[PDB]
Design a protein around this ligand. Structure first.
Ligand SMILES: N[C@@H](CCC(=O)O)C(=O)O
Ligand SMILES: N[C@@H](CCC(=O)O)C(=O)O
Lengths: 231, 135, 88, 132, 98
């Protein structure tokens, strides 16, 4: 199996519902709210000629614009011509933004999962960016030497043509090298080592892809001694 | 084959919000918006029989306000209040339900597009213009 | 003449072309053309909406200014018939 | 008076935003309106005056990327807030003299309204061409 | 495929394993998956209702696509690079002027 550095995913914070609009838009919608309501006030109380006939003011107007923004209706409507011709602009203004809001919140509430890089080792043969190595004096390093499958052949070609040494001397050496390479050096080992390294602190490593073959550990004896069949 | 440079990713312009609906549909919207308000004006103010004409509050401009009000999801204060203007208004309500729900289906995909520009392809402007060289 | 046809028959040309063009997909769009990012809406997307919103305010205010201008200082039921007959 | 003071302080300013860029070619950046001045480097406080000159695909008359820059690196909307703001500050100052016509201070507040309407446009176009 | 055909010979002599299994299925057929002329296989696919595919060359394919009743369709990409040519008997004097 193949071990890489686990990329650090981001968690949704407390105010994770203000996400599908950025803070520039959130301050501009606050500014324009004040502006529209005070313009609607100015145009309403303007000595029409008697004076207390119309029903608008600064306070009525401040929650009229809010009740038009969030779709909750109102209690009254602008009756003067310029009041109507300013209200229609705010009506158009809400229909673009709040629709964008819901239609994009439906996009944030579908996926949170990362796109999962160099999986299944074929891009390890393809790309030249992230390096990879094995253990020296190792059965895996011998396996890629003797292997005849073409993708493994190109992997062995890249491993033997290396600047500097992609190979390491002990297991923890390559562990530390991948823990410090920041996703620039992959590592090849065996899946039991892999899951043991996953189940320890700091959990910054990760197994990707599937397996490649079926090896097996065994008990080894010298050839011909009497311990063989009882073991 | 013809090699040219890379172009730069043209981001969408100012009037892109009305982009998900083609212009002909917008034209028919304006025409139907005029027609519905005028037909609703005709059904009222039709000598309703000392209040013999001012039974309703729907003038032509009040109707022009009501139709635009009902289109963008906030109803106004008045209501049709009698029959046969309302089988305009209910049909207009059905119209405004079916239209803007089709409007706001995938709006956010239309405001981040960034398609390219591609000045020439089958060359022939390399014959026509004098600006861009080639050798 | 007999040799190149063997390589065409056994796909060796395809293998070499794959090795020297398609296994070295490096730059950008070939690799990253099939991925997905969700969104984050910035102000550069929504600007003409604010422009329309602000211009409507000035238009509405200009309307009431000339309204107060006129009422500080159709016509002839009758010639409406002229208007509608020329309009028809 | 407070609004006029704050707007003048805000216009005549080196410090609006902070980002990472250069000081002077051919770095945490103390960047403002046109003097993209800088700090924390080999020298601290050499204020390069900036304008527009990209190296593009030669946009000929690409207007939403050109005329936008034209309104950007010449502040006409942010500068007009100062103009209308003092223009109305004179009218509220001229309220006492030539009085009892009960009409003049109505003209004053329109300037204060419209200066804000210019300001809000200036903020939008500045945030626009930062990411422009 | 077509009998007495270069494609049918190509799948016989081919050594790529997927093509080998395709040749295995074509030689182990009940009834004959092979046809005698092109229009025979055309009619067989037009009547098989998606139960019999057909292999031919891409120029034949696009010509059959650009005719009525347009009920056929090219799927996938290509597989190789053949080529049509002019054929002469070996050694005659027409070779180099042709
Ligand atoms: N069991 C293996 C571990 C190293 C390797 O996989 O190459 C060995 O002793 O060779
Ligand atoms: N040109 C080919 C057509 C038939 C085939 O592709 O098998 C031939 O004459 O053999």
């Amino acid at each position: 199996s193949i071990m890489i550095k686990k990329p650090q995913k981001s968690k949704p914070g407390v105010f994770s519902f203000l996400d599908p609009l950025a803070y520039e838009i959130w301050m501009c919608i606050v500014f324009a709210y004040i502006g529209v309501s005070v313009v609607l006030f100015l145009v309403s109380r303007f000595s029409p000629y008697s004076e207390s006939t119309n029903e608008f003011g600064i306070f009525n107007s401040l929650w009229f614009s809010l009740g038009a923004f969030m779709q909750q209706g109102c209690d009254i409507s602008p009756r003067s011509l310029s009041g109507r011709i300013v209200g229609g602009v705010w009506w158009f203004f809400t229909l673009i933004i709040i629709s964008s809001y819901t239609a994009n919140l439906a996009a944030f509430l579908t996926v949170e999962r990362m796109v999962s890089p160099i999986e299944s080792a074929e891009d390890l043969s393809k790309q030249t960016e992230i390096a990879y190595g094995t253990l020296d004096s190792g059965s895996t390093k011998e396996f890629f030497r003797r292997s005849k499958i073409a993708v493994f052949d190109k992997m062995w070609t890249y491993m033997r043509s290396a600047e500097p040494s992609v190979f390491v001397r002990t297991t923890a050496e390559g562990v530390a090298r991948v823990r410090k390479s920041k996703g620039k050096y992959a590592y090849l080992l065996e899946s039991t080592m892999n899951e043991y390294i996953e189940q320890r602190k700091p959990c910054d490593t990760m197994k990707v892809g599937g397996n490649l073959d079926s090896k097996g550990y065994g008990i080894a004896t010298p050839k011909g001694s009497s311990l063989g069949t009882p073991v | 084959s013809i090699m040219i440079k890379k172009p730069q990713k043209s981001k969408p312009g100012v009037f892109s919000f009305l982009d998900p609906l083609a212009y002909e549909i917008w034209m028919c919207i304006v025409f139907a918006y005029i027609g519905v308000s005028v037909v609703l004006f005709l059904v009222s103010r039709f000598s309703p029989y000392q209040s013999s004409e001012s039974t309703n509050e729907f003038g032509i401009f009040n109707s022009l306000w009501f139709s635009l009000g009902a289109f963008m999801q906030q109803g106004c204060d008045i209501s049709p209040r009698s029959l046969s203007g309302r089988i305009v208004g209910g049909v207009w309500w059905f119209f405004t339900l079916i239209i803007i729900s089709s409007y706001t289906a995938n709006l956010a995909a239309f405001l981040t597009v960034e398609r390219m520009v591609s000045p020439i392809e089958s060359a022939e402007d390399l014959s026509k213009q004098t600006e861009i060289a080639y050798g | 003449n007999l040799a190149v046809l063997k390589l065409s028959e056994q796909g060796v040309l395809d293998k070499l072309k794959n090795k020297w063009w398609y296994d070295k997909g490096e730059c950008g769009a070939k690799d990253s053309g099939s991925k997905e990012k969700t969104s984050a809406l910035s102000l550069s997307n929504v600007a003409g909406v604010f422009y329309i919103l602000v211009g409507g305010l000035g238009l509405a205010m200009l309307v009431a200014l000339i309204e107060f201008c006129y009422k500080s200082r159709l016509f002839d039921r009758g010639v409406q018939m002229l208007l509608t007959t020329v309009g028809a | 008076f407070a609004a006029f003071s704050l707007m003048t302080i805000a216009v005549g300013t080196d410090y609006w935003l902070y980002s990472r860029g250069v000081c002077k070619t051919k770095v945490m950046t103390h960047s403002g309106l046109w003097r993209t001045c800088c700090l924390e480097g080999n020298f601290k406080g050499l204020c390069k005056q900036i304008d527009h000159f990209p190296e593009d695909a030669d946009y000929e008359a690409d207007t939403a990327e050109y005329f936008l820059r034209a309104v950007r690196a010449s502040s006409i909307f942010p500068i007009l807030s100062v103009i209308l703001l003092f223009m109305g500050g004179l009218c509220i100052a001229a309220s006492e003299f030539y009085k009892t016509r009960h009409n003049i201070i109505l003209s004053a507040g329109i300037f204060f309204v419209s200066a804000g309407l210019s300001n809000i446009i200036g903020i939008i176009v500045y945030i626009s061409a930062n990411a422009g």
